[PDB]
Each structure stands twice: as structure tokens, then as C-alpha cells.
Amino acid sequence: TQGLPRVIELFEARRPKAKAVISEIDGVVRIEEGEDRLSVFVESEGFSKEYKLPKDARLLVKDGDYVEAGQPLTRGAIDPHQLLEAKGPEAVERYLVDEIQKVYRAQGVKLHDKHIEIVVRQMLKYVEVTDPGDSRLLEGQVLEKWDVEALNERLIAEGKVPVAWKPLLMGVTKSALSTKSWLSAASFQNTTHVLTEAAIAGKKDELIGLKENVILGRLIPAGTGSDFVRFTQVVDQRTLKAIEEARKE
Template sequence: GMNRLQEYIVNEIQEVYRLQGVNINDKHIEVIVRQMLRWVKIREVGDTEFLLDEQVDRFRFTDENERVTADGGEPSHSDPLLLGITKASLSTDSFISAASFQETTRVLTEAAISGRVDHLRGLKENVIMGRLIPAGTGMEYYRNVTVERDDSADQAAQELELPDFPEIIGGDGVTPTTRAAVVGGGEEEEVEGDEE
């Protein structure tokens, strides 16, 4: 099945790198292979909005089938597609991301002719546009968070008594033979260092 194919591709790619003495963690290759196997070809349309032999994203395919099944309709059936890395990269939903990879003129021309809109949902297209990436604190959930100043923290810091640290006097901190040491009430005393 699909998992066996993924394992086979990862092992074959790793074999090429191993012969050259290069060690690469499987997870990096698995990410690429997952993108190569992201698309399916519609075999039976069912009650979905897909067309026969249409190539659709696996996630869109699953969502549409769940919607149709929930409405009591007949789901569509598909066959998995294995795309090359160039074709897989150009088949992304974001035309900005695809245009930054290869065939820039063709990708942008097709996007303009078909009136496509890029909703900037991925990391790559947001970096290209110079915007915050939708990850970590750049996620929309965190963008509207306001931080309010609380005076209780300042008051607690002022009320806190810090211990008295005697001041170290003398010594340059570099010379290995002698160094200054603090004794009792802050008096300096010569201490012999290790001779090297």
C-alpha cells in the first residue's frame, strides 16, 4: 500500500546518500516523499463536486467525501498519484510559493489568467511577502493579545531586599599568578594562584 511505497522510496534515496558516505535523518526525506504522494486522481465521482480524472489534494478529497457522506450521498473514489518533486512543488495551493520555485513566468501567468487569489496560509509565501509567518507568536490567535502593565510587580521588586555583596577590590581577573580575594568585611588579600 501507500506506507510500503513511502518506505521503499525513502530507503532507495537513503541508499544513494549512504554510498556517498552522507548520513541524513529519514524525517527530512519523509517530508519530501509525503509531498510527492499528496495528490490523488478521481476514479469515481460519486455525489461529490469532483470531475472524473481530476487531480486533487488528498486533504481536499477527504474533506469533500466527509461532507458528502454526512449529507447521505455517495463518496468519490480515487487512486494515489506519485508526482516528481518539481511537479509536487508546482502543484501547491499558493501560486506565490510555486512561482518562487521554478517556471515563475508560467505560474504567475496562469494565476493571473484564472484570477487566483493567494490567501497566504503557508510559511513560504508569508516570508516572500515580508509578513509574519503563521506559526508560534505569529499565529492570528496571538496577534490580538494585549499586554497590560501591572504595578504590583514593580512594588514587589522595590520591597524585596537584596543581600549585601561585598565589593571585590583589585585584581585584573586575567593574571593567573595572583588574584584578589574578598575577606570578611571587604578587605583585599593576595592569594597565590597555580604556577604554570
């Protein structure tokens, strides 16, 4: 796949068309039988992995090749889900960006990597629990919501658990819905449930992002509306010596 379908395919982060095989472990190569069914082996002393290939498989490794864990073996797309859990979230990040730009580049567009970088960061924004601290061990939680409950339950009030987590590859749209903010979660198709679930629990918003604030018509928390700037006041010289004449009476 190429063009705009591919750009979606990456952001949405889906098992792509042409799920090119990638070695689960590093070792040596051992391709066998080009006729009946075709298969590539990855093997060392100890582990020995067998990957059965469609035949129509356009693999580009000749026999007895040395190999690296998570490195493509059959050519085509990598299932960025298989990559994550087999090479890393950081490593996944750098793949995605590199691969989207690939389309935009080859059609002819120039645009900064740091742009795509920002979105890919959100595609990773989430984590699933292993052995919890004050919840159930199946929950999907924001990475830096469970950061105050990690190296702070150890920075002062130590005890219980730092909470063990695992990274998760949310696909842009699915990373959209799972937001702390009932306000924005509402706009989406199922509005009852958000408002149901959310009301049962104390659920406060905080109005971190933008969409949320717009929904209530509040003043956007960016630019002229960013706390960092908005509070700035301005006074005149003659006016400032109208405070020297009035603050010690």
C-alpha cells in the first residue's frame, strides 16, 4: 500500500496489508524448500524460530545470513504492533515517523519531522497495568497520570507499590477517545456512556486541552489564553508614581 491510504494505515496503527515477517529473536538464517511450502528459520544454539512464508513471499535474505531481533525478513510493511513488543516503544516511534515522511517525501512534500513526532507521541500516551497500587490490574491509564504514582510513592510517602505498567500502541483515533476529559469524550458518538461512567465517579475535568474549553465556550488555554502570558499587566510611568504616593499612608 502507498499514498494516502498508507498515511492512515500508519496513524491508525493497524496490521498493514502485506504483513512482512520480522524475526522475534536474533540468530542465523535457514531457508528451506522453494516448492511445496516455503519457510525461513531463524536459529541459534538454544532458540530456533520457524516462519512459514506464503511462497509469493518476496523475502530478501539469502541462506546462512546473520540477523538481528525485530529486523524485517520478508519485505513490505512492519506490523507496528509486532514491532513495539519486540523492539520497544522508542524504537516503534522512530519507525512510524520515518515511514510516514516516506510517503509525503516520495510524492513530493517537505514538512518537518518534529510535526509527525508530536502526533506519534500521543499514539503512545497510554499504558496498561501489571500489579496495581490503588486500582484494578486491567485499566488503561495516561502515562503521566501514573507517573506521580510511580516515583512519588517513593520520593516522599514511600510504600505500597510504584505501580508496574506496560506500554500500549493506541491508534491515533483510539488514542483520541481515551481522554481524561468527559467534556470532549462526550462530543463523540456514544455520549450517554461517557456521561454515565463519568458521573458515577467524582470525575473532574481540569479542562487541560482545547476542544473541551471550546465546548463550554471558555477562553482557549493557548496563546493569549495561556496562563503563562494571560496574567501580564501594564502600567504607566506617571501611573507608577501614583502608587509611590499611595501605598504608605
